[PDB]
Scaffold this active site. Structure first.
Site, PDB file in Angstrom:
ATOM      1  N   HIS A  77     -26.441  25.462  54.482  1.00 51.30           N
ATOM      2  CA  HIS A  77     -26.164  24.718  55.473  1.00 51.30           C
ATOM      3  C   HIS A  77     -25.603  23.225  55.164  1.00 51.30           C
ATOM      4  O   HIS A  77     -24.683  22.929  55.572  1.00 51.30           O
ATOM      5  CB  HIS A  77     -27.465  24.532  56.401  1.00 51.30           C
ATOM      6  CG  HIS A  77     -27.436  23.704  57.648  1.00 51.30           C
ATOM      7  ND1 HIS A  77     -28.041  22.388  57.587  1.00 51.30           N
ATOM      8  CD2 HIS A  77     -27.208  24.191  58.721  1.00 51.30           C
ATOM      9  CE1 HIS A  77     -27.958  22.004  58.779  1.00 51.30           C
ATOM     10  NE2 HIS A  77     -27.606  22.830  59.752  1.00 51.30           N
ATOM     11  N   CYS A 109      -4.538  -3.051  70.505  1.00 52.59           N
ATOM     12  CA  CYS A 109      -5.080  -3.602  69.299  1.00 52.59           C
ATOM     13  C   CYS A 109      -6.475  -3.454  69.013  1.00 52.59           C
ATOM     14  O   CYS A 109      -6.918  -4.512  68.650  1.00 52.59           O
ATOM     15  CB  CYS A 109      -4.445  -4.857  68.964  1.00 52.59           C
ATOM     16  SG  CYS A 109      -4.676  -6.227  69.899  1.00 52.59           S
TER      17      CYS A 109
END
Lengths: 869, 869
Positions: free
Chosen positions: A454, A826
């Site tokens: 897992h 930005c």
């Protein structure tokens, strides 16, 4: 109608309906591969369950049962018959693969009576009981009534009680004894409800269980952390069962045609002889390397191998496949394009490319732009390791260098602050429960588990570090300690890395493969957006430029006023009482600042840099401790009262919308003038000394009205003009703006009469549209997520429905007045793959994100274009 | 006839005749670029001079003079006319470009009388004298009568005497005063010979000087260190002179269309206004960046720029160009494909490739495979530097990290052991004299110089590190100290790097660009030879495999007998007196050794590894100090006499041809048996635990007769057979041999009746063919080189005329008996580009060299094939 589909009626294309797994299952069925036949219960049926107030409709329920009839008729066996039942497997499958999150039940259709019919129609009691005991266990776990705790504690005792140590060591007896027990825990761990003995009650309850799982806390956070929309839904596949626990010449295992963790090409995988897939291989009893099966069962190897390739060639990409040998009969259970690690992706991409399987176009489109963050992970410092205390060795699951305080629970790894607080998740094995503490850790340390475990699996996806299957660790929460080599730990600080070793370290910096670079290159041929960075310093600038930044979209100027050797000047400016003094105060900084720009302009070699005016409100500039205020006053002749009183004058209730940004320039033009001089003097000089053309970019923040930009633009221009008195430069410069206010987006066309360019500050545009402060949101954002109100974090992924609207109409309008108007982004949204595709479609010109997100954006923009062409 | 060629009668193709420069000069002439017309005196005329007992023949001499007549008629001026002379330039040009080694004379055709005619036909006295003073200086330096020492000591005084500080500050007076002086030093530094005033005597003496230079000590070592055959010869080009010292709107400078040191694309270069090319820019007076000329003389920039590109596009590769502006008139002097640094090469290659200028095929063929060594240069350790004493900053000439003891002369840098003894060459500037101490240093440190300086230039070629133009250093040999920042040094230990800084450091490891990798990749598509490495350990194996090794061609087994925890067993075997005891002794090692092979076989993942039997004679195994012999004896019951006496028994006169290698196995089969067991047990087991096919490769060394290989082969096989008693493996294995004896090469066809493969150990084949011991050669190899007997080192570059013959006929013959016989090479010659091309043509199958030479060989083999197809 059509809540159920046979495998024979699909293809890879119906992934949406058929879930990822199911289309693949179908796709292989169509290919003619040896797969146990079956049906898939649609993703839309998930949706359906959910809308229909969590009820499996007549239409569906019927429809499933019907599909089941087909099975029986399909293969002589009758679903739950007394002496020759049909036992199927149930495995959830959403539309996008997703590790450690899928619910699996094998041998479903077995009960108190059939285990016998099964034992008789087989002559193998140990087999029947073994399956039966496994199924009672899975179902009540997956279907969750009770948990793996009180199960493993039973097969465990029995092994000790029996002295015999492998589950595979129990007999047709212990197995029924054991199934006796388990079936006892189910009802304990229940309304005293005795385990369903009705196949049909079992089948529905599994199909059901799944759906009900898809809105589980954990899935939700996983769906978040994995950018997956929770309106997709899992599909439920039902398949006829093949038995990997039939005995010594039977087995199951997971494989991958290329190292899922290195991309390195050639079969990789694990397996267990006589064992059940979905549970056994993935954990405990030391699985053997799929390459060893050459040894054990050579006629299966050839076959399995030929088929794995047939696949890869078929899906044009590395395959993750579950398989079973039932008494010398191999079966494919499911294929999936393997989940890789970043480096592995890059590698397989180049390779399939060089090999001729895929084009560069697909190599680009196939990387998850979001994972490149993986490559820029601080690696280990050589002499650091070289001279390091190796106390352990184990499986190199997911590549990397981990280092941080060890913790025994997600529940506390997490608590110790997410994936950056230098935390090591120390566990025997992990589970979907763990999912969050995992995501939060530097790397995961497991006691038991293979490559296919897992954790190996999850980490590799999350690109977290992972060292799995470390037998030698003696763990104990009760003391919350572990033991390795000779040292004992108690939530100490541990360090490790994928390349096996674990020790008692200095991290340093990337050094990207060339697969990275050819990737980065093909990216560059397709990407239309340019990619500037967001840097305020030259080193940062240097780094980005090196990662491939094509300039600067956001040079912030606050540090030029913050640094100690500068602070008092701004403080003088603040405390000053006359424009002449204020002006003057300012004056002193010119020199310190002009120097900053120079080094900047020099670093860039002629690449653009968008300089952003003074942003924060002034208050940020004063001192709030009356110890430092006392200093300042001394150093100013003022009184402690003169000062604090002035400070208190600067104080604002909602600092996010106070007097700052351009508002300051409207009232204290001096700043804009001083800023402009600093800037212009600098570029002219650097233009002088280098001979390189500079074309300054000045950006006025927080603009909400044209007339307000025009005011500051005027002041700037006069000075930029008054500066060309060196050589009248005739340096060309650009005045543009930050669109971070919604008025600005609403009035862009006018904002544009004065702005040469628009820079989208989505970070603020976001807090404004939504009306919520970043700093303060988190007191409720979580409940928002928990409650599914918000699937994505709006400050990290561009809200395209609201925030992207304002952005979008600002491009459209700013361009009505200024057609060749340049737009850029930005926020953090710049290194956000999705956001990028958005900006690409929306029409921006360039994007802009941190030095490190650059390669991300680069990749992303290439996709954005490939995707959208 | 045809000792002289006009530029108009050539092309890039006649490079051989026309020297590199000259064909380029021609090539550009043909292109129509603004170049001062001229003639080249052939490389064959060099040859000619030399054969003809160092005499410039009638045929030639005449032929030159004739070419000169053409010049005069070419351009109104008369060669040395009294009032309007022709002054030409003389610059040597061999067939392969080669930095800091070319002789250059400007303004040749000036004398005591013409300086006036020149001053009158010009109205510029300062100009005339300035040139005149420069020419008197060059000629007597290049034509070497006297040296730059007593010249710079004169223009120097004059500057101080005059208080005025730039040479460019002297007047038409000082200049004649100065020319007065210089012309005084020429005769001092002479047979009292007064400087030739006869143009014709000057011209011949220059053309002559050059030729006579091409057999200079220094050139020779440079030709060696640069793999250039000294039978090529320089050409002498004569060109009409353009004046960069005409004054304020005149100038000269060197440029390159791509950073010669980063490949980074876009004009790079330096220059000086009113200054002479060949001397001034390349040194002293701080040259300006060619990008600044945009500023100064913008109409020249455009032009020069357009032309530079026209070039690059023309030669399909980065250009190194010398240019001159004479009173606003630009001229090209010479272009050359720029000499790059490794990384720069890689970079320009990818780029021209991506840009579409060149194919991958040419990108591959154009790298100098030999320079990749540059990329694997230990870089600087980040925190090492991060936490380092930056005492200096300057020009980042040739990239790299240098670190080592500082020295003030080549003459002593060298002395402190070549390029690896951690030596820093600290100089004001360097020169061809220096060439050797340079090659020997970690990096060069200069006091004065630009990017185009001699050192910047040379280093970049040699890929040595270079920080140039460090004004702030106060040097003094008289004390042999320097000063920087505040520290004084005296042959101390200094450290620096190309990225400007120099400090008072830990080196670490490469991390190759992706340009490197795409390179390495295209290499792989073209290369036919496979590339195994030579490693005895797994880390080394890991490294190569990572550099792209395709297995092991030479796993040496001595360390398996050398390691302390093993040594006594072999020592027991030696001192033992019975085969039973000896056998037994041996036995004990099996386990330690089987472990070695296992880790090996595991590291390789199924890649071949050629295991080489015990090599050295036994003597190497005993101890020679009777302190350790005393130990051994104790630990053996023997007496100190029993031991030493046995040791002395093992002693041999010529250990290179004693009893060792296979000779040992013929007399002590036990070894071959023990070796075989170790090997076979190991691979079977690893084959067991992994499931990966292993196919062992056993190589018997020092075989000189078939019957002798057969003997040891028998013994090996019986055991390899007796080992398949685990699972009778039916592991297939291969027995082959080392061809390192000439008999073996002579009798290959027979050696082949028993050998499954041939491994060429050219290192020994070389010492045998030549008859000379490596260890002992150096007492004369140098004089061999000095005397031109040997242009190349035979242990580093495959002797293709003798040694390659034996190799060659061994392939041909071994293949007469065994057609699919695999051949491989495994000396140092394996990472020798030339050798590789040889092995490629000769028919070998794979090559084999150290972990680090791998990329070299890789590149090389790709070329080998591209070249030879």
């Amino acid at each position: 109608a059509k809540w159920v589909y046979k495998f024979e009626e699909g293809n890879a294309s119906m992934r949406n309906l058929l879930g990822g797994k199911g289309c693949n299952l179908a796709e292989m069925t169509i290919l003619g591969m040896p797969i146990p036949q079956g049906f898939t219960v649609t993703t839309e049926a998930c949706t359906e369950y959910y809308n229909s107030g969590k009820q499996i409709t007549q239409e569906i329920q019927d429809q499933i049962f019907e599909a089941i009839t087909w099975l029986e008729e399909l293969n002589g066996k009758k679903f739950g018959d007394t002496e020759d039942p049909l036992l199927v497997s149930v495995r959830s499958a959403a539309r996008a693969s997703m590790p450690g999150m899928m619910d699996t039940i094998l041998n479903l259709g077995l009960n108190d009576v059939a285990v016998e019919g099964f034992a008789k129609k087989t002559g193998n009691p140990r087999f029947a009981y073994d399956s039966y005991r496994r199924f009672i266990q899975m179902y009540s776990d997956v279907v969750m009534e009770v948990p793996k705790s009180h199960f493993e504690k039973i097969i465990d005792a029995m092994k000790e009680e029996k002295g015999v140590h492998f589950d595979t060591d129990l007999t047709a007896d212990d197995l029924k004894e054991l199934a006796e027990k388990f079936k006892a825990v189910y009802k304990e761990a229940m309304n005293g409800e005795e385990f369903p003995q009705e196949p049909k009650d079992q089948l529905m309850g599994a199909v059901k269980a799944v759906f009900r799982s898809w809105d589980n806390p954990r899935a939700i956070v996983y769906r978040r952390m994995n950018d997956i929309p929770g309106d997709w839904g899992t599909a439920v596949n039902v398949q006829t069962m093949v038995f990997g626990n039939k005995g010594e010449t039977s087995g199951t295992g997971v494989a991958f045609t290329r190292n899922p963790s290195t991309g390195e090409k050639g079969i990789y995988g694990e397996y267990l002889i006589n064992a059940q897939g979905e549970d056994v291989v993935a954990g405990v009893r030391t699985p053997q390397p799929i390459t060893q099966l050459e040894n054990d069962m050579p006629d299966c190897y050839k076959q399995f191998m030929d088929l794995a390739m047939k696949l890869e060639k078929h899906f044009r990409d590395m395959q993750d496949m579950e398989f079973t040998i039932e008494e010398g009969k191999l079966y494919f259970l499911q294929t999936a394009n393997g989940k890789r690690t970043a480096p592995a992706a890059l590698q397989i991409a180049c390779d399939l490319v060089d090999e001729g399987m895929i084009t560069e176009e697909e190599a680009v489109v196939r990387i998850e732009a979001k994972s490149l963050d993986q490559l820029l992970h601080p690696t280990f410092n050589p002499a650091a390791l070289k001279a390091g205390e190796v106390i352990g060795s184990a499986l190199p699951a997911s590549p990397g260098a981990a280092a941080g305080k060890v913790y025994f629970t997600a529940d506390e790894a997490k608590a110790a602050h997410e994936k950056g607080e230098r935390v090591i998740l120390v566990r025997l094995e992990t589970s979907p429960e763990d999912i969050e503490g995992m995501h939060a850790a530097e790397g995961i340390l497991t006691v038991r588990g293979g490559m296919t475990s897992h954790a190996a699996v999850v980490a590799r996806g999350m690109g977290t570090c992972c060292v799995s299957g470390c037998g030698e660790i003696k763990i104990n929460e009760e003391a919350k300690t572990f033991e390795l080599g000779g040292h004992t730990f108690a939530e100490g600080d541990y360090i490790s890395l994928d390349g096996s070793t674990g020790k008692i370290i200095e991290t340093q910096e990337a050094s990207v493969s060339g697969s990275f670079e050819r990737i980065m290159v093909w990216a560059d041929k397709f990407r239309t957006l340019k990619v500037r960075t967001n840097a305020d310093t030259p080193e940062d600038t240097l780094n980005a430029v090196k990662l491939g930044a094509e300039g600067i979209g956001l040079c912030r100027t606050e540090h030029m006023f913050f640094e100690a050797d500068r602070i008092m000047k701004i403080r003088k400016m603040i405390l000053s009482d006359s424009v002449e003094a204020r002006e003057e105060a300012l004056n002193e900084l010119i020199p310190f600042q002009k120097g900053d720009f120079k080094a900047m302009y020099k670093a860039l070699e002629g690449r653009p840099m968008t300089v952003r005016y003074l942003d924060p409100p002034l208050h940020e500039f004063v001192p709030h401790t009356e110890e430092e205020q006392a200093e300042l006053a001394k150093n100013m002749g003022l009184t402690l009262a003169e000062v604090k009183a002035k400070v208190d004058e600067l104080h604002e209730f909602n600092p996010m919308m106070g007097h700052r940004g351009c508002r300051l320039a409207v009232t204290y033009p001096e700043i804009a003038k001083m800023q402009t001089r600093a800037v212009m003097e600098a570029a002219i000089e650097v233009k002088e000394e280098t001979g390189i053309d500079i074309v300054p970019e000045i950006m006025i923040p927080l603009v909400g009205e044209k007339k307000e930009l025009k005011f500051v633009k005027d002041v700037v221009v006069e000075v930029a003009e008054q500066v060309k008195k060196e050589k009248g430069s005739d340096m060309q410069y650009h005045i543009g703006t930050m669109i971070e206010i919604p008025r600005a987006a609403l009035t862009a066309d006018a904002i544009a009469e004065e702005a040469e360019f628009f820079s989208f500050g989505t970070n603020d545009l976001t807090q404004m549209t939504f009306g919520f402060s970043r700093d303060d949101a988190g007191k409720f954002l979580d409940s928002y997520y928990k409650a599914k109100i918000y699937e994505s974090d709006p400050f990290a992924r561009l809200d395209q429905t609201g925030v992207g609207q304002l952005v979008e109409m600002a491009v459209k309008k700013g361009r009505q007045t200024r057609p060749g108007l340049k737009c850029g982004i930005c926020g953090e949204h710049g290194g956000d793959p999705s956001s990028v595709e958005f900006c690409h479609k929306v029409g921006l010109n360039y994007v802009s994100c941190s030095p490190f997100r650059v390669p991300i954006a680069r990749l992303a923009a290439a996709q954005a274009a490939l995707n959208n062409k």
